[PDB]
Amino acid sequence: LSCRFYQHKFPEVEDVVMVNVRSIAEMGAYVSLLEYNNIEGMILLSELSRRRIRSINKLIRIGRNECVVVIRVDKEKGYIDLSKRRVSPEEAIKCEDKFTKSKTVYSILRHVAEVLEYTKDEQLESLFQRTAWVFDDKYKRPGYGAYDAFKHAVSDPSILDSLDLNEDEREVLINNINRRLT
Amino acid sequence: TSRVQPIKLARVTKVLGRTGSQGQCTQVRVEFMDDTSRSIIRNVKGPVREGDVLTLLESEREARRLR
Amino acid sequence: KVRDKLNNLVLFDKATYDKLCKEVPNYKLITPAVVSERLKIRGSLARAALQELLSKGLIKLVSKHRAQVIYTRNTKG
Amino acid sequence: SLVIPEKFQHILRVLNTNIDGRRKIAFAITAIKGVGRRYAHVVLRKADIDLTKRAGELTEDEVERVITIMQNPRQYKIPDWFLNRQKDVKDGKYSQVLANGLDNKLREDLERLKKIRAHRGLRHFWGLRVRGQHTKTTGRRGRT
RNA sequence: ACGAGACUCUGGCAUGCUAACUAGUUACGCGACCCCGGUCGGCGUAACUUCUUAGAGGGACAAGUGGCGUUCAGCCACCCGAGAUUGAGCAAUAACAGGUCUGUGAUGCCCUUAGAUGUCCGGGGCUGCACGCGCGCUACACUGACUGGCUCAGCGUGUGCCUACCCUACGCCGGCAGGCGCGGGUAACCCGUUGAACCCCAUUCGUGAUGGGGAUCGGGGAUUGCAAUUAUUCCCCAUGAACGAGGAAUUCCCAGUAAGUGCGGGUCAUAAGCUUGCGUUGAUUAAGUCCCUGCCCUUUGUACACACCGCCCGU
RNA sequence: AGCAGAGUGGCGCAGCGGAAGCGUGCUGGGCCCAUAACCCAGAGGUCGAUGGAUCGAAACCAUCCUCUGCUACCA
Numbered sequence A: 001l002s003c004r005f006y007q008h009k010f011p012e013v014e015d016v017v018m019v020n021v022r023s024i025a026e027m028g029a030y031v032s033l034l035e036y037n038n039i040e041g042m043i044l045l046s047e048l049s050r051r052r053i054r055s056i057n058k059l060i061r062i063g064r065n066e067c068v069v070v071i072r073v074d075k076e077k078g079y080i081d082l083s084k085r086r087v088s089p090e091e092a093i094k095c096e097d098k099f100t101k102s103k104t105v106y107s108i109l110r111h112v113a114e115v116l117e118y119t120k121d122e123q124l125e126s127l128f129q130r131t132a133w134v135f136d137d138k139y140k141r142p143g144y145g146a147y148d149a150f151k152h153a154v155s156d157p158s159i160l161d162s163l164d165l166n167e168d169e170r171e172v173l174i175n176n177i178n179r180r181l182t
Numbered sequence B: 001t002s003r004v005q006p007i008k009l010a011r012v013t014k015v016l017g018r019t020g021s022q023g024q025c026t027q028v029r030v031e032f033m034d035d036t037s038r039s040i041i042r043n044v045k046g047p048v049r050e051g052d053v054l055t056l057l058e059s060e061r062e063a064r065r066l067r
Numbered sequence C: 001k002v003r004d005k006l007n008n009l010v011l012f013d014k015a016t017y018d019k020l021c022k023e024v025p026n027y028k029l030i031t032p033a034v035v036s037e038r039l040k041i042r043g044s045l046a047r048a049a050l051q052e053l054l055s056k057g058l059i060k061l062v063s064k065h066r067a068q069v070i071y072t073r074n075t076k077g
Numbered sequence D: 001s002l003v004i005p006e007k008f009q010h011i012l013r014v015l016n017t018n019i020d021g022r023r024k025i026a027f028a029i030t031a032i033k034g035v036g037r038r039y040a041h042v043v044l045r046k047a048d049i050d051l052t053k054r055a056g057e058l059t060e061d062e063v064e065r066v067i068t069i070m071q072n073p074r075q076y077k078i079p080d081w082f083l084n085r086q087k088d089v090k091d092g093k094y095s096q097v098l099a100n101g102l103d104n105k106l107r108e109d110l111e112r113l114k115k116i117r118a119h120r121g122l123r124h125f126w127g128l129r130v131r132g133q134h135t136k137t138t139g140r141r142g143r144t
Numbered sequence E: 001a002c003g004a005g006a007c008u009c010u011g012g013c014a015u016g017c018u019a020a021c022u023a024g025u026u027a028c029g030c031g032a033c034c035c036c037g038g039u040c041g042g043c044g045u046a047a048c049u050u051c052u053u054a055g056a057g058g059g060a061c062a063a064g065u066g067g068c069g070u071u072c073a074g075c076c077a078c079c080c081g082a083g084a085u086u087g088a089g090c091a092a093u094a095a096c097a098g099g100u101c102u103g104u105g106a107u108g109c110c111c112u113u114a115g116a117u118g119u120c121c122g123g124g125g126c127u128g129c130a131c132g133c134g135c136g137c138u139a140c141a142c143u144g145a146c147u148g149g150c151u152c153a154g155c156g157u158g159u160g161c162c163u164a165c166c167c168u169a170c171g172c173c174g175g176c177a178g179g180c181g182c183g184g185g186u187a188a189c190c191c192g193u194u195g196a197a198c199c200c201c202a203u204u205c206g207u208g209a210u211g212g213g214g215a216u217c218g219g220g221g222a223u224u225g226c227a228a229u230u231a232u233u234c235c236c237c238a239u240g241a242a243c244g245a246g247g248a249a250u251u252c253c254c255a256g257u258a259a260g261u262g263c264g265g266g267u268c269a270u271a272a273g274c275u276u277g278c279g280u281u282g283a284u285u286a287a288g289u290c291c292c293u294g295c296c297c298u299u300u301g302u303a304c305a306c307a308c309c310g311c312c313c314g315u
Numbered sequence F: 001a002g003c004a005g006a007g008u009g010g011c012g013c014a015g016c017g018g019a020a021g022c023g024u025g026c027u028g029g030g031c032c033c034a035u036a037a038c039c040c041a042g043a044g045g046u047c048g049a050u051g052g053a054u055c056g057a058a059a060c061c062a063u064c065c066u067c068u069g070c071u072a073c074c075a
Helices: A092-116 A121-139 A144-153 A168-180 C014-026 C032-039 C043-055 D025-031 D037-046 D060-071 D099-116 D119-126
Strands: A016-024 A029-033 A065-074 A079-083 B008-015 B025-032 B039-045 B053-056 C060-064 C069-072
Touching: A016 A092, A065 A092, A092 A121, A092 A144, A092 A168, A121 A144, A144 A168, B008 B039, B025 B053, B039 B053, C014 C032, C014 C043, C032 C043, C043 C069, D025 D037, D037 D060, D099 D119
Parallel strands: none
Antiparallel strands: A016 A029, A016 A065, A065 A079, B008 B025, B008 B053, B025 B039, C060 C069
């Protein structure tokens, strides 16, 4: 079962995100945001590059990850607009670093929940709120509040025991975090 | 943007020549009902005639040519 | 992009029968396709169950066709 | 009735092959090799089992009844032109053959054709089209 | 003067005219069935052309009205009206090293002419298969597949010259493919009121490479023909592959049109996935443009004229 | 004798738990009257080898082999 990454249901404007392209279309295309529970976005043909293009499949490449910046977000109707043309290479390194650390935290906690054998979207939301979202809101860092948390809690049990989630599941998650992040 | 532009309903008065690269669109002389003095020219796409009402999302743009 | 491979059961067990008996007569629009989608059952089983409740008098028939049948609930009062 | 009965067998092991009980009994035994859609209707018509029932809820008496009907077709008023092997080249009798027997009979028939070195056996040994059709354009996935 | 137009064929209508036992309608009588009337492509004979058939004629001409236009050639819309642009046939000067010597007792020249490149018979090949391309047929399913019932057409063709080979109603046998006796038609007379398919109604199936799709492959039985193996064609039972709406690119069409769907003719002893016609159901979009690919006229420039797929400079 | 770099498609190279790609070489197709430019698709991989924990390593661990950057022949 899959769950969303951060507590924001939709990203804010001018935010970088690692996007997998799903299918090419006529007026635009159809894509999927990895770190927002696979919601359908859109990239435009005019938002590909500033220069002239001679092959639409040379830079789109459906089936490949791409870094895009959010342009317009409409939470009322679920409309997401993306832009690859405005993406600068300076934030790109921080982008896949944040994406990799968030996906490793999500993979570790999903493995812990699969060991715990709980198959419900609300159950994953509640356990991941008890595990990561609380300390993410405490440290005030989107994405940066999990990798440093497990790095500081791999050698310190008192830092990891501050969350009042459970006892046996908390010990299983602490053992899974200490086994991987070593 | 921070601007919720009110929509305008406007009524055509005459049909000008058909612009565009392949002639897909045509030019009309259109006028409003809330103020029946202001008349602007708009590029409209589709089968039009004399008497149909057009829904203009903005009323401050003047019709560009084919290019 | 979730697959979620379907396994539509052929014969009714203990629990799906009485959830059907408590939920299907409280539905505004009753169709074999939509009750097979809601209860994750096979289409012939849905047709047999709606025919059984039609014979039981808890289901009001509206229109009958070779492509679909349309059923509706009864009045509460 | 519409509720599932007790000891509803999910799978069957009729002639050492897995047969599911979810399919219709007129079509679940079609998965047995050597018995098709048309042959399954006659077997279930000579035997007194209605074809509106499922496969996994029938009992062992009628199961073994239709099993002995399938291995013995002709002694239950089944005509001789309904058989997949009529006037066999070795023993010369009408006998419907089943899955592993069908593979064995086809293998020894191809071996007999290769032994007598006919054109059909030579084309079967080479691995080409044997029924006599054009091979200039069609049949591209035979080799790489 | 030619081309266009004008002309010819067909479609769309006239309850008016000319005539129909090889086409019918309406009345009357007989006959069958039901509960006093209804049904009968059951039988027969008193008028007629309402259906059908096919001849002469009629009708549409931008005729009437209102706008635009030198108020000229014309354009737009509307009323009455079966139609206010039906579809085709024919189609000028000048040429293409366009295709055909394999349509010809149309033919120049060249080759061969008795161990023949003539002719005839027997066998084989034209199908052969690591691959590429074009025109096509069937599908990827639930607006669907299977199983019953109900119900509706129009173009045609049909017993042949030396030439042998036609289309079939009815009765029996067999699941079917088929076989045997009997009759009709040289044809509005008989097949035939051509009980066509797609559709319509009602079960079974339930999103599963599945009852989709039928490739590949095995066995048996009939017909044609002197002869079917390299399976002629058909029928029956098994075998159940790829295929989940198709990349770059590209074809055809705007009204009973595209598309779905079946039936005739040509090849035919045996015979349609091809071609040419016919009828059934029946749409979306558009009344514009010169952007792409081209065409017609005029002006301009040219070192090209087997004519830009031209010409031509230098290391 | 010993320490580190590297072992990936014909060649060069990126990749570290949810996972065989890029540039380029070959073949085929399209575009054009034709060729060169241009576009598309496919084939080609024990990720050097072994064993283990790990739900599951091209990767985490230990060893071996190969070529360089280096101390050098050290009884």
